[PDB]
Symmetry: C2
Subunit: 71 residues, 2 copies
């Protein structure tokens, strides 16, 4: 049985690389919980099974949320 506090976390590292909105299949936002002490953001790209953990702290990411949510 895993330590419950972080059982759910799925990101181990982050990418500060600009994500091209037109390259996103979808964006997942996972608010912190009693199973993962931090907010995790995962972008699923359209090409070659790529996915990536994004910096929820960053603002460029916040502009991504707005874009992805509007178009």
């Amino acid at each position: 049985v895993p330590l419950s506090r972080t059982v759910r976390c799925t990101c181990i590292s982050i990418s500060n690389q600009p994500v091209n909105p037109r390259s996103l299949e979808k964006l997942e936002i996972i608010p912190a919980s009693q199973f993962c002490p931090r907010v995790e953001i995962i972008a699923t790209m359209k090409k070659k099974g790529e996915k990536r953990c994004l910096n929820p702290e960053s603002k460029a990411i916040k502009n991504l949320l707005k874009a992805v949510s509007k178009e």
Copy 2:
């Protein structure tokens, strides 16, 4: 390489009602594509992990997205 996939929007119905960010377990934003002409937002609620589609066009959801974007930065 692309996998076989759904070629239509995935939401049966979409909710216009306000949502308390606290009750959200997860949120996924799916941008419009040639498979579904509009953005879809699938919420996974903490209760029974019920999957509920949110209407990104509704004021309530636009508000939820804003509360989320804020309560996401120190």
